Amino acid sequence: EQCGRQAGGKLCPNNLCCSQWGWCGSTDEYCSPDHNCQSNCKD
C-alpha cells in the first residue's frame, strides 16, 4: 500500500515506479506493464 490504487494514489518521492502490490521502487518489475504497473509507469 505504499502507492497505487491500493494506497489511495500515494505517489512516492524520486518519482519511483509503483508496482501492482502497491510498492515504490525503481525496477522493471515495478515500472513495466508486464507486472501490472500503477503509476510513473515507464513506457
Side-chain angles (χ1 to χ4, degrees), residues 13-34:
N14 309 141
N15 99 275
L16 306 183
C17 310
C18 300
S19 98
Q20 143 168 316
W21 287 92
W23 287 97
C24 317
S26 196
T27 94
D28 267 70
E29 316 185 3
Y30 281 32
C31 237
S32 224
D34 331 320

Side-chain angles (χ1 to χ4, degrees), residues 1-13 15-24 37-40:
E1 297 113 273
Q2 234 70 169
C3 173
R5 182 172 65 94
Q6 291 123 264
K10 298 265 184 69
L11 286 146
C12 257
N15 99 275
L16 306 183
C17 310
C18 300
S19 98
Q20 143 168 316
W21 287 92
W23 287 97
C24 317
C37 63
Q38 293 273 12
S39 351
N40 285 273

